[PDB]
Structure formats: structure tokens, C-alpha cells
DNA sequence: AAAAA
DNA sequence: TTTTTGG
DNA sequence: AAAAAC
């Protein structure tokens, strides 16, 4: 009867009755980001998370009694809501400069806090200032953020994604038929839309140097099409992302494909390659959300003095690591009850 | 900013 | 009170 | 040797 303050303990479902809410907590967690207030950052989006797992909708103080996650400050937030409909704080983040120079400039792929911090200080507000000016570098990334901005601004929705989902099985199976390709993210989780399409890449018989050439084999025959836009493999080193083998591309999605102008739309796809034993420690990591990860690792660390990450279950009492071949066996090991995909949108 | 140590 | 917060 | 990419 008692709500966890861990994500990884709670079922949070994409039915949110608590949007004017947590709308609100997200901007603040936002702006504590940009103004480099890590702690006051994170206590917002763990708020935001509980709220999220709700089954009905705050309608008065007494409301949030025993709910987890919401000391004064917050508290105070959710009460100048409920007061007239609107968080008087966020609206005051809403209007900042330097708050919507961030949220512009870091929307732009290959942007993120440091450049736009930079870009700011140099007293740029607008993209078509910052893409027209004749002394500022770009990097690779960037060029490609700007050239395909509409396009990537622009959510990715499920007829999209199952049309990304088909050219990545075809042209995974042309070289390993063996393997098995997951889309993992938010999409897994049962999403209609996202900024990216995700996949988990593991084949049972391949060896060491077949797993290393699957994703340059992929990507030179989508370049040989014509519909790689942007290329970056990142190379297998199995503190930050993970070692696995790993590419992020933008492709060029032809409408035809899509079962739901140019006549195609530039889309972010993740590929993530992994040894066929460590397949459950990668899927559940890359399942997500952001959220329900942070607290599997924190639930693991702090309440069984475990070591969790997206290869791996370490226990440090027996120490030995723990080995799974399903999600079900890492909950079992952690001592959680299973979560489904579906509701782990925390 | 909130909860654990 | 001080420490931790995914790492 | 910094920055972005999850
Ligand atoms: N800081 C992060 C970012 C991501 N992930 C994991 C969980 C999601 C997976 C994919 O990253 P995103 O593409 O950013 O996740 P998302 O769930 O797919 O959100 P969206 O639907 O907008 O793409 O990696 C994580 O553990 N920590
Ligand atoms: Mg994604
Ligand atoms: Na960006």
C-alpha cells in the first residue's frame, strides 16, 4: 500500500493524470540542469516520476499525503497549481532568455550544454544567426543537425519506426541470419512517438570479428543506397554510455516504406551490438526510461550492495557476478518484482 | 531538493 | 547535522 | 582533449 521512492518498484503506465503537474516539474528540472544545480535537478524529476505513477489526478493538498519525493519546495508548486491552474515558477522559467536560448540551440543535433552556453555568452538567440555566420566551426555532427533540423525536430511515430524497424532487420539478417534484432527505447515501452528509433543487435553463433563487421557491412550497403545521411560507429571497449559497439546514423526514410512534399524524412536510428550472453543486461538497459534505469542501479547499490550496468550484475557480498538470459532473471536477482516494459515509463 | 547515514 | 544522488 | 552521441 506504500509507494516506493524507486522507480524500479513502482508500474508507471502512459496514462498520466497528473500532466499539469509534472509539465511544470519537468521545466524546473530543466532549468536547475542549465543552471548547473544538479541536486535541486534530479529531486525535481524523481517528483515528476512519482506523480507520473499515480492512478488519479491531485485535486487538493490533501491529495499528496504519503506520496514520496515531494518535501516543501515541491509541495509548494503543486499548491500554486492547484490555486489557478498554472505554476507561477515555470512561466517565470518559460519567459527567461537564457532558459529559451538553451532549449533552441540545444534542439539543434550535435549541440549540447557547452556549445550552447558558448553561443549564448557570444550573444546569438536565433539558429538562422548562428547557421548564416561566416566565423563560427561546426562539427560534423552539428552540419548534419542543422541540414536535417525540420526533419529531426519533428517527432518519430510507430508507422515510422516499424519502416526502420524492417530496413534494419533486412539488411542485419543479409550479413548474420542468425541474429536477433530488438527495438528497444521508449517505442518498446509502448510509446506512439520519439525523438530516435532504438535496436539491440545479438546473433548466438557469430564470432568475435563477425559481431565487430555486422555494423560496418550494414551501414556500407545503406551508404551504397543512398540513404545514409550520417555515420558515427562507435568501436567496442567491452564511469557515462556504455562499451558496446554502437552507431548513431540519421537515415533517409522513404515515404513509400511508411504504411501510415521531398518524399522521404531523415530519422535518427541507434544501433547497438552485444555478445549474445550479456543480450539481458543490454535490453534492460536500453529499454529505459531514463528514470526507471537511474533507480534499478540505485535500488541494486544501496538496498542489496549490488553493481548493475548494461553488461553486467555484480553482487558484492558473494563476489561473483550474476549471469541472466532473460529481464525476469535480473529482477528475480535484484529481489524486485518483474515490471513489463509497458510499465516502466517512469 | 529530498531522504539516508 | 553531513552525505548522496546512475556512473 | 574537449564536446556530443545513449
Ligand atoms: N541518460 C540516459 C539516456 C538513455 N538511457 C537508456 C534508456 C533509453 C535508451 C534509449 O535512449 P533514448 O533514445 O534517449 O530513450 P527513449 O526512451 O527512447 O526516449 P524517446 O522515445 O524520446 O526517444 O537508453 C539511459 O539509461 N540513460
Ligand atoms: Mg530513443
Ligand atoms: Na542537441
Redesign the pocket.
Known amino acids: 500500500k506504500k509507494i516506493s521512492?524507486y522507480a524500479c518498484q513502482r508500474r508507471t503506465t502512459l496514462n498520466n493524470y497528473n500532466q499539469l503537474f509534472t509539465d511544470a516539474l519537468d521545466i524546473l528540472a530543466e532549468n536547475d540542469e542549465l543552471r548547473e544545480n544538479?541536486?535541486?535537478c534530479?529531486?525535481?524529476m524523481?517528483?515528476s516520476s512519482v506523480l507520473k505513477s499515480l492512478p488519479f489526478p491531485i485535486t487538493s493538498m490533501k491529495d499528496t499525503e504519503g506520496i514520496?519525493?515531494?518535501?516543501?519546495?515541491?509541495?509548494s508548486i503543486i499548491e500554486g497549481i492547484i490555486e489557478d491552474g498554472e505554476s507561477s515558477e515555470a512561466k517565470a522559467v518559460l519567459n527567461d532568455e537564457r532558459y529559451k536560448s538553451f532549449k533552441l540551440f540545444?534542439s539543434?543535433?550535435?549541440?549540447?550544454?557547452?556549445?550552447?552556453e558558448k553561443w549564448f555568452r557570444m550573444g546569438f538567440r536565433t539558429l538562422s544567426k548562428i547557421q548564416s555566420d561566416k566565423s563560427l566551426r561546426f562539427?560534423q555532427?552539428q552540419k548534419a543537425?542543422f541540414l536535417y533540423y525540420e526533419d529531426l525536430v519533428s517527432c518519430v511515430n510507430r508507422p515510422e519506426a516499424e519502416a526502420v524497424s524492417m530496413l534494419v532487420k533486412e539488411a542485419v539478417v543479409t550479413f548474420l541470419p542468425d541474429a536477433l534484432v530488438t527495438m528497444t527505447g521508449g517505442f518498446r515501452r509502448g510509446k506512439m512517438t520519439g525523438?530516435?528509433v532504438?535496436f539491440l543487435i545479438t546473433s548466438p553463433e557469430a564470432t568475435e570479428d563477425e559481431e565487430q563487421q555486422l555494423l560496418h557491412k550494414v551501414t556500407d550497403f545503406w551508404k551504397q543506397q543512398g540513404l545514409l545521411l550520417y555515420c558515427?560507429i562507435?568501436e567496442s571497449t567491452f564511469?557515462?554510455?556504455?562499451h558496446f559497439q554502437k552507431c548513431?546514423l540519421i537515415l533517409k526514410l522513404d515515404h513509400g516504406r511508411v504504411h501510415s512534399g521531398k518524399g522521404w524524412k531523415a530519422i535518427?536510428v541507434?544501433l547497438v551490438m552485444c555478445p549474445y550472453d550479456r543480450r539481458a543486461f543490454a535490453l534492460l538497459?536500453?529499454t529505459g526510461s531514463?528514470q526507471f534505469?537511474?533507480?534499478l542501479?540505485?535500488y541494486?547499490?544501496?538496498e542489496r550492495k549490488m553493481?548493475?550496468?548494461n553488461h553486467a550484475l555484480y553482487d558484492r557480498t558473494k563476489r561473483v557476478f550474476l549471469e541472466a538470459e532473460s529481464e525476469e532473471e535480473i529482477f528475480a536477482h535484484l529481489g524486485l518484482d518483474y515490471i513489463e516494459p509497458w510499465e516502466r515509463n517512469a
Open positions: 521512492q544538479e541536486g535541486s534530479l529531486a525535481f524523481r517528483a514520496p519525493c515531494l518535501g516543501d519546495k515541491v509541495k540545444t539543434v543535433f550535435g549541440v549540447g550544454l557547452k556549445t550552447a562539427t555532427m543537425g525523438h530516435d532504438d558515427d562507435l564511469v557515462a554510455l556504455d548513431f535518427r541507434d538497459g536500453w531514463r534505469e537511474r533507480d542501479r540505485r541494486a547499490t544501496h553493481m548493475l550496468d
